[PDB]
Amino acid sequence: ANRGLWDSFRQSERGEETIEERFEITGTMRRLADQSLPPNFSCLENFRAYVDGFEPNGYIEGKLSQMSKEVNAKIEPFLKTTPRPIRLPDGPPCFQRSKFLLMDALKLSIEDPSHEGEGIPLYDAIKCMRTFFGWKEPYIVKPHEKGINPNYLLSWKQVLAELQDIENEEKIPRTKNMKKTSQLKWALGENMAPEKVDFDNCRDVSDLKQYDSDEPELRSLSSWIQNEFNKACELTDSTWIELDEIGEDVAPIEYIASMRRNYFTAEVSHCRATEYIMKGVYINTALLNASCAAMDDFQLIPMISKCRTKEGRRKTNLYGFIIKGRSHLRNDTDVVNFVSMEFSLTDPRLEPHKWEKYCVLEIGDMLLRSAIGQMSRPMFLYVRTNGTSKIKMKWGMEMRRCLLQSLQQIESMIEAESSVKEKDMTKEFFENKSETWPIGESPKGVEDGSIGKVCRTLLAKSVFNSLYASPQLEGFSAESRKLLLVVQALRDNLEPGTFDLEGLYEAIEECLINDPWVLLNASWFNSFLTHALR
Amino acid sequence: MERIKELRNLMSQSRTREILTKTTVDHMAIIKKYTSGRQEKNPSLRMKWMMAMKYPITADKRITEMVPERNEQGQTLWSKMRVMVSPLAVTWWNRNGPMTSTVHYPKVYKTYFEKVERLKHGTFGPVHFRNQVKIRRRVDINPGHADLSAKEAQDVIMEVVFPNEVGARILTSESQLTITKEKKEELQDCKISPLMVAYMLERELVRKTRFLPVAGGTSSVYIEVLHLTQGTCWEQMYTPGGRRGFLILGKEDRRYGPALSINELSNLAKGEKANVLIGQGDVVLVMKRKRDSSILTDSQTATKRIRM
Amino acid sequence: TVSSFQDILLRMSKMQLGSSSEDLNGMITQFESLKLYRDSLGEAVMRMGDLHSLQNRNGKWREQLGQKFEEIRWLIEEVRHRLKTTENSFEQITFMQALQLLFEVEQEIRTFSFQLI
Amino acid sequence: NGKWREQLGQKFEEIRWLIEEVRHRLKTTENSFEQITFMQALQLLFEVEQEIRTFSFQLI
Amino acid sequence: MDVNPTLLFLKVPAQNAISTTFPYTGDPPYSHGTGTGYTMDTVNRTHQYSEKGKWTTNTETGAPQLNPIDGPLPEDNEPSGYAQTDCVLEAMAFLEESHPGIFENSCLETMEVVQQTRVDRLTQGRQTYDWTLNRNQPAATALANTIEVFRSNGLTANESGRLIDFLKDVMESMDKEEMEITTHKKKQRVNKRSYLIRALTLNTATPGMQIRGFVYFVETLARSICEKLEQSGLPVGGNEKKAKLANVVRKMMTNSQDTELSFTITGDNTKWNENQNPRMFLAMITYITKNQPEWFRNVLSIAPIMFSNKMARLGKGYMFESKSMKLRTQIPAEMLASIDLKYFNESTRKKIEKIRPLLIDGTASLSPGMMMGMFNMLSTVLGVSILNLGQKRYTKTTYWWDGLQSSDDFALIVNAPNHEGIQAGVDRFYRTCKLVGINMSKKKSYINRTGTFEFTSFFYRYGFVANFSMELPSFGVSGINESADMSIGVTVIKNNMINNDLGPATAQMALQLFIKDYRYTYRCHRGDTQIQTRRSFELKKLWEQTRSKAGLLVSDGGPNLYNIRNLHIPEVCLKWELMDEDYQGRLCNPLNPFVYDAVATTHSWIPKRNGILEDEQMYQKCCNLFEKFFPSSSYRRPVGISSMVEAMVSRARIDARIDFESGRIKKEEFAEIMKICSTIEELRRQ
């Protein structure tokens, strides 16, 4: 009984005989099995008898001999003049749709808080705010063309007033709950909730549509996403990341891995993409905590980041404010609304089309210490209404994996190159200064760069892939991978060939509806194609 | 007292009553798996949330008279509504607390303690970059013990860890494996845990093999360092360095007195017969042996009774 | 010996870049690593360790601890008695300051003596 | 002083491996350039191994 | 300078940096499954691909059914599910001839698996559709509900603890004229046809509860058959697939009397799921089990019969809104067969008008096709048969082909003396595949000279077989305690290194991130750190009094010593030799009030946790009550002959008598124990 044989042995004595098993159809299963056969049979037993006495004489060849010749797979050659550029859609220009603006942001530094200072973010934001003088009367500079702008003005004024009116309290609070005002209620959309009733009472009503089943609009490509990508690959004066330590190394392979990762960490430590990752992680974590804590209050959430200065002083930076609505989340798909306000110095009247879902206010003047003297520039506030998800908060909290992916890509290239020249290639890649990689373009032609530049480019690409997820990206990536593999096979003198080159193309254009990132990727692919065979 | 009282009221409800009455012991493991299938509600976030609040850990009553309520700083360590305690209590125990001898630890976790001795008494060679092909065969990750198969390893484990819950086989044979004597003598007053000792004994005493795509060493000592020796396009060279005869007559009889336990058969007599509880619930009548009843060549002598 | 190093490296380079092998690059790399290892050892040759400072005055140095302890409590008792007996204000303050200084110095020397051994 | 003791063991391993493989390569060559280079290789590494052993004994 | 990474391919080969094309690291935060809209399109497409079949009305369910077997031969390149029984039978016969003895050993190995499987096998898996609550439930709850319902109607045969008895009882249940459903106390009646319909419905696709057991045996047999073939790469994973990829190239590039031309093709199959037919699966099963006991044949043939007549559920329904009254509503698919079509738009109206004939009780009838997943290893064998048909003995010509084929992806190599032979071989392979019911995707397949190809995210250059098939680890906290997370993390990293191709440089940074996350989560920073938390004072007090600071665990101020070479050693055993005696005595004290290669330690604590069946935890109470009398049940399976209550009473009586004899407790409660035991046995007497 221990090994698992007692049950069958016990259930095998039918009087004074031994029977192995028993199983019969005997009923409705028989009738059901009766019409689960090819059309030229009626009983299962006859089909079994026919199958048992089967011998293959000539069936396959005989069937093949009488099939029409239009069923075929003909190969057409792939030459150097075969491929054609991909067609991009045309229409009105696209607009920014990111959660927080990237290139047009400033910070209000706290200037090296004490080493023992660990407090609530609200007090840090207040101390950052008290360091600025130059507020003026705010006024609208760019209407939203869909909504009410005085509501935005009143919201900003209420934020200022309720931040200033803390002192009228006998006890100092920990978090701030905003008063439910008409403009705030309109901004958070608390009065635009449809009512639900059974279909029986409202069967006779008119003007009823299925749902928002409308064909998506078509938009073209602008020149600001390329500028954002260009700016995202530059170096800063801060650190933005500090990793912990591990044990000492003994084996030579440990030394090789250590030098590889040390070079990689040194090259991409001061990049802007790390700042974006930290900003996103902090904002998403704070918003998730606030949403999970308070469910029936309008809480004020600051945008705060931390870094280390060049000489070695910790610094805290404030970006803006977020006001959250009502959050009663039962599943992972329910949406919570909020409104975001951010500071900037960029005049919106240079690219009005870029900002289409924003309201822009002028709020003050800023003194610049660059060169000698002091010059004043206007200060602007961008206000927008949004609401993301519960899942996407978790999606935004994991952005440290992009560094891991970039390191994996670099190490994969190093290993692939070292596998052919059977020796160690970690030295010829990093410390060699006469090697250049083509990762650029200009009216002159193709430019060149160093290893740190390509590492930062890969990190920025991973970050932007994380920040602009969409199925169009997946489809375009797959089809472009297939096309690139075909092109590379062509370049190796291997005589490639295809069966249907068009359908791949129409797939490529049908995965090219609206996303500016995918349009930029398609333009990059076209620019690669125009040079790969010339 | 508590267990019998909890069993008593479980008989009041019929729905559980036929469950208890109609289920044999051998089918218990069939029942045990009808628990649930949905618990993973983002465990990392749950742990992060629980670590923020005070008193997130559960403990017993006696911690109230072994750890003070407040420390020198003035922070509470435990609170009254098992009781709720904070990790500060654990750190205080690690800082200030009673001390006990730890001489039995190397004898229980020796399979882990051999790995460090093998590793730190080792040397390394050069690394080679090339392409190689890896083949598959059966690899032994646990060497086990020689002169011991899988059948009697469980018997040894049961005899050492649970002396009072063995039945049928191991109780009717007339023998004693040597290793059992040392295992019982060494662990005379070990009080760590029965389950942990059983698991470690099975780990260091039972062999088991698997399939791996290894292109280097084949012995067991070369398997646990497989992540350090091989690679996609590189190879690192490395050397390790370094109970009497009883027979059952039937079920319990009501004329021979209450049944007795396994450990109380030592007294016995010179041929008395008595009831005894063996296994996971069996009760049988046993009486010792007046002869040898061995497995010698006599079994083959039956061949003389045939083919004349 | 050095000229052998450069001669071997040059001959093997001429041998290799005309026809390539896995082991050929392997020996080139292993040779170069050994070359730098020998150079580093030679750089470490003319420095060694400073054994002259490792054998400083330490023979009789160890035994004066008991000698100091011999007069420590002697002088502390003398100071206690003379502070008790005296009557002036200058002497009392001086003796109190000396007593505090001596307590501090005695702790200090005992702490370092315990730490060093 | 402890790190040198553990690089030295690896140095001996590299020495013996490269000696044996160089001898094997010498065994099956049919070119005078090869033979001359290998003669110098064996002589040089014999001298180097002797010096490394002397320093190893001196260090302890 | 305008920077774009694609031009980096102008210097580096594509296969060396192909890892830059995959954009994501995990699951994207959006869903594309869609509700009732996609199922209707799937049904319409799979019925449109087989328009020239034969129509029949079921005599036991009353659902229309379409039979495309032995239909007209195709005339164009569009997908067509018109298969031939003779071709499949001949392919199976030739596969048997090529590998003699391949179908009998598998049956013999499967027979012992059939006769020894227990009922617990169905307790693990994904979510399962429940025919009693019309929802999705975990496997254990669905199984318990099914057992309760079956017992309530006099169908009690699964108490033997055998899966075959459960299947027999399910078959007996399917032949009853009335079914009772008791919900906690509503009592609902189900007739024969309704129960039969609810026993053949597939989810939107996890199967039901009355079909998993029959699918399991077929899957085991298919796996046993596949494990004996070299052209199947489905069961294996890792370096084995690399070796399989190498062997085919080595075999086809023998370069003996080199006057031959070799071309490789990477291909994909279009409309794979909605072109297979369960009838050919039944024919294959019947042919495989020749000269075998009849009960085995019945057991292996039950499942395709059920699959041949199945129902697909639509979904939740639609949502409507009004732009004037600010009104919203939800409409279900149960009444969708009679609603007026003026509400919907054009596409939905066409879908409804097309789908109306095949609608019964809110579920559509879908005979010709496989819904989603399942029966992968049998379609794999069907595909491998066509590849086996490419030997020299069967072509009887000059060209010949061979290759390897997974569930849906395939790679092929063709040898011919010139280009015309290669073209003829490719055309013959295409026609042979189309004759069986497999269609090749023309727009996502390509052919080139042998030396480079691809197979399921396995890129093969001249000698490098680097793979990108699975994702990176999570390097996060598991969430049990502060003693298991470290071991789980290091084991995960080591296992990813051993099986996948994680690099050494990547592992170090992954370990760094994991240690950072662990320190942040458990509030355990180093003693010589200025970070202020609630746990800082105790950590600093412990750090100051320790003379050997290298022996403290990371959980309390200690440093990290982990690297690549010591990822398989527990931390306590690693730091045993570097910590003080008092710290060792305090940490490893088996008398703590607090208490995958882990030591007990004082850091292993437990955190605070916060119809049909009246109570859902009735088995668990008995289970947990058992070990309080027999403590070895947590280590191994118990063996016995009597019931549980007999052991309970005997053990309690023996323990009480010994306790009274030893004088541990007085006589006051001994009589009480005897009386309560007598009451228990009297209650059992009923």
Residue numbers in the entry:
A (entry chain A): 183 to 716
B (entry chain C): 1 to 81, 88 to 248, 691 to 756
C (entry chain T): 5 to 121
D (entry chain S): 62 to 121
E (entry chain B): 1 to 184, 207 to 226, 242 to 632, 657 to 671, 681 to 756
From the primary publication:
Genome transcription and replication of influenza A virus (FluA), catalyzed by viral RNA polymerase (FluAPol), are delicately controlled across the virus life cycle. A switch from transcription to replication occurring at later stage of an infection is critical for progeny virion production and viral non-structural protein NS2 has been implicated in regulating the switch. In this study, we have solved the cryo-EM structure of FluAPol in complex with the viral NS2 protein in which NS2 is dimerized to stabilize the symmetric FluAPol dimers in a highly ordered barrel-like hexamer. Our structural and functional analyses show that the viral NS2 protein facilitates the switch from transcription to replication by affecting FluAPol dissociation from host Pol II and by promoting the transition of FluAPol from its transcriptase conformation into its replicase conformation.
We then applied cryo-electron microscopy (cryo-EM) to solve the structure of FluAPol in complex with NS2 at a global resolution of ~3.0 Å, using the large protein complex. In this structure, three NS2 domain-swapped dimers arrange three canonical FluAPol ‘dimers of heterotrimers’ into a symmetric barrel-like ‘hexamer of heterotrimers’ superstructure, with approximate dimensions of 251 Å × 247 Å × 184 Å. The complex formation is achieved by an elongated shape of the helix-bundle-like arrangement of NS2 binding simultaneously to two neighboring FluAPol units. The symmetric FluAPol dimer is organized into a similar conformation as previously seen in both human H3N2 and avian H5N1 FluAPol structures, with this symmetric architecture required for vRNA synthesis during replication of the viral genome. In the hexamer complex, the three symmetric FluAPol dimers were almost identical and could be well overlaid. In contrast, the three NS2 domain-swapped dimers showed almost the same conformation at one end but a significantly different conformation at the other end, mainly due to the flexible hinge region of NS2, which leads to the varied distance of adjacent FluAPol dimers. Thus, the FluAPol-NS2 hexamer lacks standard symmetry and might be dynamic. Cryo-EM density for the mid, Cap, 627 domains as well as the Cap-627 linker of PB2 was absent due to conformational flexibility. Previous studies of influenza virus polymerases have revealed that the C-terminal domain of PB2 exhibits a higher degree of flexibility in solution without the addition of capped-RNA and vRNA promoters, and the similar conformational flexibility of the PB2 C-terminus observed for the FluAPol-NS2 hexamer complex indicated that the polymerase should not be in the transcription state.
